[PDB]
């Protein structure tokens, strides 16, 4: 561990005081947004949160409980949401208007992700067992993938809009090339329970979380299992997963945030939240040691890895 | 309640 990591703890540097389902930085890591069961997307200024004694600069009320947020990687002011009615909405946080309301899903949509490299493209996954690919210039879905089980998470590859990872209630990660959706490129088995999150560390490194109380690392160039991470408790809830080039962080049903270095299977450190409660959302500030966290009480903390 | 679905 000493070769790979210089950290032993997480420091709390700010706190905002139900469930927060999603917490995400905008394109420049300047603003962040929260959303969840209270039917409200709240936008905060990160530097104000860190420097001050805590009010959002924008709030947008919604028709349904929110499951996920994804900021646009090109249009600074645009953010997508998925909700419990199945609706995938693109919002403008300056005008507060919904720019697009995509309504084809028949059940709760659990996840939405805006592509980094083709930024008008966004993908969603739903309890209706469909993955839908959307373009912000078109009202109808561009691609539909009919799957056999509830979709819990979808994520675009960071280097190409042709590939998506799909975490399924069937316990597998389905990795698709959107140029030919008749079969996935590869289906990664290993998790013993539903796959609740998928996130990329890099073009070829995919991480997942599952209610089998593990995170797993996968090689999507050569289609190989790499590593399994253990320590946290996650047997039933969406507890959050965030990764960067070197680190994975996830929530726990013990109301603790866990951090792993990608080369080491047991945690570098953990943090007991001030709160019966579970961590519900986490987000790294890009490749820095700073991260946003939130729990089922609605408390938000800014944490930083420290020696 | 934020419960993950599971086909099994």
Numbering used by the authors:
A (entry chain A): 347 to 363, 372 to 407, 411 to 632, 644 to 675
B (entry chain B): 28 to 35
What does the original paper state about this entry?
The COP1 E3 ubiquitin ligase is a central signaling hub that integrates inputs from plant light‐sensing photoreceptors. COP1 contains an N‐terminal zinc finger, a central coiled‐coil, and a C‐terminal WD40 domain, which is essential for proper COP1 function (Deng et al, 1992; McNellis et al, 1994).
We could detect binding for most of the peptide motifs in ITC assays, with dissociation constants in the mid‐micromolar range. Next, we obtained crystal structures for the different peptides bound to COP1 (1.3–2.0 Å resolution, see Tables EV1 and EV2, and EV4) to compare their peptide binding modes. We found that all peptides bind in a similar configuration with the VP forming the center of the binding site (r.m.s.d. between the different peptides range from ~ 0.3 to 1.5 Å, comparing 5 or 6 corresponding Cα atoms). In yeast 3‐hybrid assays, we find that, similar to HY5, UV‐B‐activated UVR8 can efficiently compete with HYH and an N‐terminal fragment of HFR1 for binding to COP1.
